[PDB]
């Protein structure tokens, strides 16, 4: 309950999306500040998910309401406020 943050999660990506694209893609919805993509140790390869951080907390809501169930690189992505 009560999250109050700006870090969002992207679900439904491909091998074409990255922090670079997320930066440009999510910048209109809100000027991103940080983007982190975790990996494994045995495979060191994600699946297709990342974290988007915005400079403005309210800006994230836009990415949330804009990227949630949207289309990116021909892929359906889902966004939500981290916690």
PDB file of C-alpha atoms in Angstrom:
ATOM      1  CA  UNK A   1       0.000   0.000   0.000  1.00  0.00           C
ATOM      2  CA  UNK A   2       1.140   3.520  -0.853  1.00  0.00           C
ATOM      3  CA  UNK A   3       4.082   3.150  -3.245  1.00  0.00           C
ATOM      4  CA  UNK A   4       4.753   6.734  -4.365  1.00  0.00           C
ATOM      5  CA  UNK A   5       7.676   6.137  -6.761  1.00  0.00           C
ATOM      6  CA  UNK A   6       8.797   6.754 -10.354  1.00  0.00           C
ATOM      7  CA  UNK A   7      10.454   3.446 -11.255  1.00  0.00           C
ATOM      8  CA  UNK A   8       8.384   1.394 -13.709  1.00  0.00           C
ATOM      9  CA  UNK A   9       8.598  -2.185 -14.988  1.00  0.00           C
ATOM     10  CA  UNK A  10       8.394  -3.237 -18.641  1.00  0.00           C
ATOM     11  CA  UNK A  11       6.918  -6.637 -19.458  1.00  0.00           C
ATOM     12  CA  UNK A  12       6.672  -8.076 -22.958  1.00  0.00           C
ATOM     13  CA  UNK A  13       9.890  -7.047 -24.632  1.00  0.00           C
ATOM     14  CA  UNK A  14      12.139  -8.548 -27.297  1.00  0.00           C
ATOM     15  CA  UNK A  15      15.859  -8.759 -28.075  1.00  0.00           C
ATOM     16  CA  UNK A  16      15.573  -5.426 -29.920  1.00  0.00           C
ATOM     17  CA  UNK A  17      14.641  -3.243 -26.933  1.00  0.00           C
ATOM     18  CA  UNK A  18      17.147  -1.821 -24.484  1.00  0.00           C
ATOM     19  CA  UNK A  19      17.721   1.113 -22.131  1.00  0.00           C
ATOM     20  CA  UNK A  20      18.604   3.153 -25.200  1.00  0.00           C
ATOM     21  CA  UNK A  21      15.258   2.566 -26.869  1.00  0.00           C
ATOM     22  CA  UNK A  22      13.422   2.695 -23.555  1.00  0.00           C
ATOM     23  CA  UNK A  23      15.123   6.023 -23.002  1.00  0.00           C
ATOM     24  CA  UNK A  24      13.836   7.464 -26.277  1.00  0.00           C
ATOM     25  CA  UNK A  25      10.548   5.540 -26.142  1.00  0.00           C
ATOM     26  CA  UNK A  26       9.770   6.461 -22.552  1.00  0.00           C
ATOM     27  CA  UNK A  27      11.289   9.973 -22.700  1.00  0.00           C
ATOM     28  CA  UNK A  28       8.083  11.453 -24.279  1.00  0.00           C
ATOM     29  CA  UNK A  29       6.016  10.034 -21.442  1.00  0.00           C
ATOM     30  CA  UNK A  30       8.666  11.270 -19.037  1.00  0.00           C
ATOM     31  CA  UNK A  31      12.365  12.075 -19.103  1.00  0.00           C
ATOM     32  CA  UNK A  32      13.916   8.866 -17.843  1.00  0.00           C
ATOM     33  CA  UNK A  33      16.684   9.047 -15.255  1.00  0.00           C
ATOM     34  CA  UNK A  34      17.757   5.443 -14.932  1.00  0.00           C
ATOM     35  CA  UNK A  35      17.252   2.086 -16.637  1.00  0.00           C
ATOM     36  CA  UNK A  36      18.451  -1.238 -15.231  1.00  0.00           C
ATOM     37  CA  UNK A  37      18.236  -4.650 -16.889  1.00  0.00           C
ATOM     38  CA  UNK A  38      19.229  -7.648 -14.675  1.00  0.00           C
ATOM     39  CA  UNK A  39      20.782 -10.856 -15.999  1.00  0.00           C
ATOM     40  CA  UNK A  40      21.637 -14.363 -14.809  1.00  0.00           C
ATOM     41  CA  UNK A  41      25.046 -15.737 -13.820  1.00  0.00           C
ATOM     42  CA  UNK A  42      24.969 -19.057 -15.686  1.00  0.00           C
ATOM     43  CA  UNK A  43      23.314 -17.664 -18.815  1.00  0.00           C
ATOM     44  CA  UNK A  44      23.765 -13.915 -18.228  1.00  0.00           C
ATOM     45  CA  UNK A  45      20.803 -13.357 -20.557  1.00  0.00           C
ATOM     46  CA  UNK A  46      17.462 -11.815 -19.603  1.00  0.00           C
ATOM     47  CA  UNK A  47      14.122 -12.739 -21.158  1.00  0.00           C
ATOM     48  CA  UNK A  48      12.719  -9.389 -22.172  1.00  0.00           C
ATOM     49  CA  UNK A  49      12.067  -7.177 -19.168  1.00  0.00           C
ATOM     50  CA  UNK A  50      13.568  -4.028 -17.669  1.00  0.00           C
ATOM     51  CA  UNK A  51      13.116  -1.144 -15.214  1.00  0.00           C
ATOM     52  CA  UNK A  52      12.440   2.466 -16.271  1.00  0.00           C
ATOM     53  CA  UNK A  53      13.139   5.412 -13.946  1.00  0.00           C
ATOM     54  CA  UNK A  54      11.797   8.918 -14.479  1.00  0.00           C
ATOM     55  CA  UNK A  55      12.888  12.325 -13.287  1.00  0.00           C
ATOM     56  CA  UNK A  56       9.302  13.231 -12.478  1.00  0.00           C
ATOM     57  CA  UNK A  57       7.113  10.908 -10.407  1.00  0.00           C
ATOM     58  CA  UNK A  58       3.986  12.089 -12.216  1.00  0.00           C
ATOM     59  CA  UNK A  59       5.746  11.521 -15.541  1.00  0.00           C
ATOM     60  CA  UNK A  60       5.948   7.801 -14.797  1.00  0.00           C
ATOM     61  CA  UNK A  61       2.157   7.626 -14.528  1.00  0.00           C
ATOM     62  CA  UNK A  62       2.097   8.695 -18.165  1.00  0.00           C
ATOM     63  CA  UNK A  63       4.470   5.911 -19.186  1.00  0.00           C
ATOM     64  CA  UNK A  64       2.329   3.657 -17.037  1.00  0.00           C
ATOM     65  CA  UNK A  65      -0.933   4.735 -18.671  1.00  0.00           C
ATOM     66  CA  UNK A  66       0.731   4.917 -22.093  1.00  0.00           C
ATOM     67  CA  UNK A  67       3.042   1.888 -22.256  1.00  0.00           C
ATOM     68  CA  UNK A  68       0.689  -0.403 -20.301  1.00  0.00           C
ATOM     69  CA  UNK A  69      -0.630  -2.910 -22.844  1.00  0.00           C
ATOM     70  CA  UNK A  70       0.944  -0.993 -25.722  1.00  0.00           C
ATOM     71  CA  UNK A  71       2.984  -2.058 -28.756  1.00  0.00           C
ATOM     72  CA  UNK A  72       6.773  -1.822 -29.020  1.00  0.00           C
ATOM     73  CA  UNK A  73       8.910  -3.336 -31.779  1.00  0.00           C
ATOM     74  CA  UNK A  74       5.851  -5.349 -32.744  1.00  0.00           C
ATOM     75  CA  UNK A  75       5.620  -6.643 -29.182  1.00  0.00           C
ATOM     76  CA  UNK A  76       3.011  -6.125 -26.481  1.00  0.00           C
ATOM     77  CA  UNK A  77       4.526  -4.544 -23.383  1.00  0.00           C
ATOM     78  CA  UNK A  78       3.145  -4.032 -19.893  1.00  0.00           C
ATOM     79  CA  UNK A  79       4.248  -1.374 -17.415  1.00  0.00           C
ATOM     80  CA  UNK A  80       3.670  -0.925 -13.681  1.00  0.00           C
ATOM     81  CA  UNK A  81       4.973   1.048 -10.707  1.00  0.00           C
ATOM     82  CA  UNK A  82       7.744  -0.822  -8.886  1.00  0.00           C
ATOM     83  CA  UNK A  83       7.771  -1.383  -5.126  1.00  0.00           C
TER      84      UNK A  83
END
